[PDB]
């Protein structure tokens, strides 16, 4: 075989395997499947208007901190300017949180089940945090469609990293460098799927995963809209956390 023909044969390079290893570890170190810290949040109240906002605000604020910790471990991420790291996290946080949550989501009853009845969230809980079907229905649909992909954890953490390092985010300065970082991750994912995800599950899997990124942009836009409306009321904004205000807007 010619060097060309042989070079066309897909192979997970040592560097690409290394990238996957780092992202798996990063996820391990920032997602607690025991959910032990939820005790620390303001208590969930299920009955009054916005009764679940304090608890879900605390959950989300906690999860933003975890997203930041994961982002810092993405190969290339820290070579970005402080400003670009900030804009990428401000814009992606809600999306990565939606991705992370797929781990607790269950299609048994279409809820996020975090180990106990107190920490099991359904569409009614989300509405009681100030959100409407315009966000919630598509969010459930997203969770269902993602679950249907039955991603390998490898693919799950690659997707989160690709989500974070997106060059077309608002406020991005060195889009060229963000794009180079993302491309290394995207190629790693494409090659992982070809070499490690057996058919039929692999069918158009990359394209399906990129469609989920597009879905996340739409969810982000609608969340931002409802969040601005929600936070416009000072009495609501009072119930949020300082980190949520800084990241999602004030």
């Amino acid at each position: 075989n010619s060097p060309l023909k042989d070079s066309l044969r897909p192979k997970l390079s040592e560097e690409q395997q290394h990238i996957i290893a780092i992202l798996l570890d990063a996820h391990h170190k920032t997602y607690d499947p025991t959910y032990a810290d939820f005790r620390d949040f303001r208590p969930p109240v299920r009955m009054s208007p916005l009764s679940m906002l304090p608890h879900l605000a605390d959950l989300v604020s906690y999860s933003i901190q975890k997203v930041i910790g994961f982002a810092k471990m993405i190969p290339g991420f820290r070579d970005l300017t402080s400003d670009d790291q900030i804009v990428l996290l401000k814009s992606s946080a809600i999306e990565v949180i939606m991705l992370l949550s797929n781990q607790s989501f269950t299609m048994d009853d279409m809820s996020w089940d975090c180990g106990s009845q107190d920490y099991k969230y359904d569409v009614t809980d989300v509405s009681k945090a100030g959100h409407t079907l315009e966000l919630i229905e598509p969010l459930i649909k997203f969770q269902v469609g993602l679950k249907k992909l039955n991603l390998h954890e490898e693919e799950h953490v690659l997707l989160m990293a690709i989500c974070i390092v997106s060059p077309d985010r608002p406020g991005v300065q060195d889009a060229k460098l963000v794009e180079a970082i993302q491309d290394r991750l995207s190629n790693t994912l494409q090659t992982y799927i070809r070499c490690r995800h057996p058919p039929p599950g692999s069918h158009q899997l990359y394209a399906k995963m990129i469609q989920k990124l597009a879905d996340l942009r739409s969810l982000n836009e609608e969340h931002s809209k409802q969040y601005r409306s929600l936070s416009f009321q000072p009495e609501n904004s009072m119930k949020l956390t300082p980190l949520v205000l800084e990241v999602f807007g004030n």
Partner: peptide, 11 residues
Amino acid sequence: KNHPMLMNLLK
């Protein structure tokens, strides 16, 4: 725009 807490968590 100043994101002190984000900036500090990123250090």
